[PDB]
Symmetry: C2
Subunit: 191 residues, 2 copies
């Protein structure tokens, strides 16, 4: 797939669409879809990394489980480990977490860790590929402003760098393009 | 009947981008400017006695016998659009004046063009010739637009009888409505 060429901001509208252009023509961009594409690939890359920078917690977290649940979790300890969940056995069906990747959404670590662990519970069986995918989604969730052109330019540069600037992880188009040729044809003035 | 359009910007020195509650507007500057000029000239050609201006450089025209017949048949029609032909013998005329509001410096070409429309139609009435002439006038005349220029254009275009379509029937505006944009991005 050809990489989209550098795009330059024209402006925005309604805190919803970005208007940009280059020599090729006009780009109309759903700014929310763009942000989702950018965020997903960021976290998906992160969770794939082999040795993240870890952050010890001021206060260690605790989690307690049934004999059924703790057992599911036990087989999948490798998987959870790779997604940034560092469980430490303290007793029967119980776990402690003292640290996490530094790139976890700040201040929502505990919620995230529980949700990841919950995912493994609900499926009973699951592999790294699907878990890493689910985890990056949950991370992208963590939390209509009208963007200035400097913020727009930053977003466009970031979008260009992703593996798919045209369609978001959930199937939404991100970009609608009218080439200069297409624009001339639509106005029928010079063609 | 578009509401106020607020500028987003311009591109390629050719297109203006604008928005309001109804969505996105992409405007061809050149076509917009002709629609704006047309609204003006259509009014002007409708005046029974407009301000007239003597020419510094009078024009001469020669026609075939049959063309001159057609020209004489349409004396009233031609005068109604500001073409004041004066007979001087066989198949020949001079023009010594014209409305002050004829596009400056392009009077000679315009007059010749208007007469040729009459010759080609063979028979044409005042209403249709006024329309054709105003279209011709609106296409006469000669960097990126400044912000005041963009606002003036948007307000002026909006103040015409058809902001969407040019005197020649081509689009002035490509409009992606809120509804259409939501569909495009499958929201």
């Amino acid at each position: 797939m050809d990489r989209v060429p550098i795009m330059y901001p024209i402006g925005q509208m309604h805190g919803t669409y970005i208007l940009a252009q280059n020599e090729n023509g006009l780009y109309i961009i759903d700014q929310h879809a763009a942000q989702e594409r950018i965020k997903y690939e960021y976290f998906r890359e992160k969770v794939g990394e082999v040795e993240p920078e870890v952050q010890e917690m001021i206060v260690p977290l605790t989690f307690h489980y049934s004999t059924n649940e703790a057992l599911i979790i036990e087989q999948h300890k490798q998987e959870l480990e790779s997604v940034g969940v560092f469980l430490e056995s303290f007793g029967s069906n119980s776990y402690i977490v003292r640290c996490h990747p530094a790139w976890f959404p700040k201040g929502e670590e505990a919620e995230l860790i529980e949700e990841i662990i919950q995912q493994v519970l609900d499926s009973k069986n699951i592999d790294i590929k699907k878990l890493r995918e689910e985890a990056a989604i949950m991370m992208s969730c963590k939390g209509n402003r009208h963007l200035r052109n400097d913020e727009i330019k930053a977003l466009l540069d970031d979008l260009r760098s992703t593996s798919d600037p045209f369609t978001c992880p959930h199937g939404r188009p991100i970009i609608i393009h009218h080439s200069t040729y297409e624009m001339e044809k639509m106005f029928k003035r010079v063609m």
